[PDB]
Amino acid sequence: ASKRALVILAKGAEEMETVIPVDVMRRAGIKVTVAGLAGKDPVQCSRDVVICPDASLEDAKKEGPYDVVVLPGGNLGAQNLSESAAVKEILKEQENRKGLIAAICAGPTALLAHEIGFGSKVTTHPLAKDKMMNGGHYTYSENRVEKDGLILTSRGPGTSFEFALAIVEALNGKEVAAQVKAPLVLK
Amino acid sequence: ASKRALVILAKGAEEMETVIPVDVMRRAGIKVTVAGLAGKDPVQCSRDVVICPDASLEDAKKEGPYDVVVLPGGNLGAQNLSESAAVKEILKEQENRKGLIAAICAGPTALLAHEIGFGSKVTTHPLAKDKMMNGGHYTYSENRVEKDGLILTSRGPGTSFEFALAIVEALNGKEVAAQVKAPLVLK
Ligand SMILES: *[C@@]1(=O)C(=O)[N]C2=C(C(=O)O[C])[C]=[C][C]=C21
Ligand SMILES: *[C@@]1(=O)C(=O)[N]C2=C(C(=O)O[C])[C]=[C][C]=C21
Ligand SMILES: [Cl-]
Ligand SMILES: [Cl-]
Numbered sequence: 001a002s003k004r005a006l007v008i009l010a011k012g013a014e015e016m017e018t019v020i021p022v023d024v025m026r027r028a029g030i031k032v033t034v035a036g037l038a039g040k041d042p043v044q045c046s047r048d049v050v051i052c053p054d055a056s057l058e059d060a061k062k063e064g065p066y067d068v069v070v071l072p073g074g075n076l077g078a079q080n081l082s083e084s085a086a087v088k089e090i091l092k093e094q095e096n097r098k099g100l101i102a103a104i105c106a107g108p109t110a111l112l113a114h115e116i117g118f119g120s121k122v123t124t125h126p127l128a129k130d131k132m133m134n135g136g137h138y139t140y141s142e143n144r145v146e147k148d149g150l151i152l153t154s155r156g157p158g159t160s161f162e163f164a165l166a167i168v169e170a171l172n173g174k175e176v177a178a179q180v181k182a183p184l185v186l187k
Numbered sequence: 188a189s190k191r192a193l194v195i196l197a198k199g200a201e202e203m204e205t206v207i208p209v210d211v212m213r214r215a216g217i218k219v220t221v222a223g224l225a226g227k228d229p230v231q232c233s234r235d236v237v238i239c240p241d242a243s244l245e246d247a248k249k250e251g252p253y254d255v256v257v258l259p260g261g262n263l264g265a266q267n268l269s270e271s272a273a274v275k276e277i278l279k280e281q282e283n284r285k286g287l288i289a290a291i292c293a294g295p296t297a298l299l300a301h302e303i304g305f306g307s308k309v310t311t312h313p314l315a316k317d318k319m320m321n322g323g324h325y326t327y328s329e330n331r332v333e334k335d336g337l338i339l340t341s342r343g344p345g346t347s348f349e350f351a352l353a354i355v356e357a358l359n360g361k362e363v364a365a366q367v368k369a370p371l372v373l374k
Contacts (some may be wrong), residue, residue, distance in 0.1 A: 019206045023234040023344070034236070042229070042239050047210040049221070052237035125372065144372070156372030157210070169247050171219060185312065185331070185343030187374065 003030045003171040006066040008087060009053050010037040012076025015045035016157040017104050021070055024164035027180045030174050032066075037080060037087070046074040050099045059087055067171050073105025073125065073156075082113035091116045094152060097098035100170055102152040104163050108132055111151065121148035125156050163187055190358040193253040195274060196240050197224040199263025201278045203344040204234035204291050208257055211351035214367045215359050217254075222247035222316035224267060224274070252356050256281045260292025260312065260343075269300035278303045282337060287357055289339040291350050295319055298338065298374055312343050313317040348373055 005025050009018055025032050036043055036053035043051050054060075060129055069090060069123050071081055073185070091114050093106040094101055103111060106128040111117050112135075122138045124131075144159045145152070145166045152170065154163035161184065169177040191371055192212050196205055205221070212219050219367070221232055223240035230238050241247075257275060258268055268274050278301050281288055290298060293315040298304050299322075309325045311318075311331040331346045332353045338356065341350035348371065356364040 014210075015206050016203075016210050019202050019236055020344075021238055023201075023203050026234040047213040050239035051240060086274055125370075127370070144374070156370070158373035159208075160370040161345060169245055182346040183312075183314070183343070186345035187331070 003067040005030050005068045005070055005167070006060060006064070006090070007032060007034050007070040008037055008057060008070065008081060008090070009034050009043050009051060009072070010077040010080035012080060013045050013072045014075045014077065014157060015041065015047055016047035016053065016070040016106055017074065017107070017160050018045065018051065020160035021072070021164040021167060024161065024180060025167060027133040028168040028176055030168070030171060032171050033060050033063070037084060046076065061086065063088070063138035065093060065097060065099060065135035068100040068102055068167055070167070071103035071110050073107040075106050078106040078109050081107070081110040088103060088114040098150060100152060100167070101150050102163065104154040104160060105156050106131070108153045110136065117127055117149060119149070120151040121146055122151060122153045123155050124153065141179045190254040192217050192249060192255045192257055193251070193255040193277070193356070194219060194221050195224055195244060195268060195277070196221050196230050196238060196259070196266035197264040198231055198259045199267060200230065200232050200259045201261035201264065201292055201344060202234055202236035202238065204259040204261065204294070204347050205232065206239065207347035208259070208351040209312035211348065211367060212354060213365065215363055217355070217358060220247050220250070220253075224271060233263065248273065248277060251277070251347060252280060252286060252322040253283060255287040255289055255354055257354070258290035258297050260294040260310060262293050263295040264298050268294070268297040275301040285337060287339060287354070288337050289350065289354050291341040291347060293318070293342050296339045297359040299324065304336060306336070307338040308333055309340045310342050311340065313356045
């Protein structure tokens, strides 16, 4: 039974933070569903790359649950994730079932908006720290990837490979992550 | 006058190697055109990410020339680039005008196919070395990014940020590359 990942893709998502985890997770044999927040139509990312989702979120929700729910960053993408009742319900269900929740850059701020994972150690992009920390509901970390309880976070486009490989390690183990990593020519 | 980049997007392109340079170049204020080899329709990349190009290559060619032509990798994408008469004409024109040509992973093998930049020092993905070196028409390098004459090459998904930033440095200078790099949270 392959592990399954839900990647929620909103207008304004950071395309690197979307594509790097999708691709690396697929390299790891994870079944990844790129689900469009708004519907089935193509999504204009933060730097104007347009990505066609595999499915609407509405439809993807019905094939749940997933081994990981992944929230890319991009400030405007994260804001859209933060405003979504659908995302709230998906994250609450994932938390209740003790499933992995992964978020990068400003993505973790959607966890705050939806009251997910309070008390966890988290990281964010440096410029998203104050937003994430409003209320002191999390403990802040400067690690490039952080993992506490159910919650796996990371900092930016430049930590996206590390974030992706951490998700792979969590789901498929250290040996698979190492196998996937070698051909990428990471430093 | 902003610099302009042509990124040629074929079926089977490595989506990370496409998106990372597009995004980082746009961060640098470069006007980037993602041009579909096959036409205007969406492109299924190597790990099934589907990207909608900005324009067909046919149409983008008419708005040339560009400060850089960028060839992503992905083995099947590179093979498609290698087989294309349109790509041949674009690279020959770019070489003749002494413009930058950039290619990553197996992307440089399209330079071989089209007889571009012979005698240059180049790198590739390690698994694409023998193909690139058939005939000894280039000198091989293990540098993560290499630049000789007109030709800027790089090795893999994991060198895509370095490749992109090198393109930025070539076009817009070292200070802009440094400015663009800082918010990415690269190691
Ligand atoms: C990142 O992709 C994101 O989600 N936010 C972000 C910032 C920013 O200003 O966050 C508040 C800067 C650079 C990368 C990202
Ligand atoms: C890379 O994205 C590419 O273009 N080729 C490639 C290989 C490969 O087998 O090249 C022959 C392996 C890993 C990454 C890439
Ligand atoms: Cl952003
Ligand atoms: Cl490939």
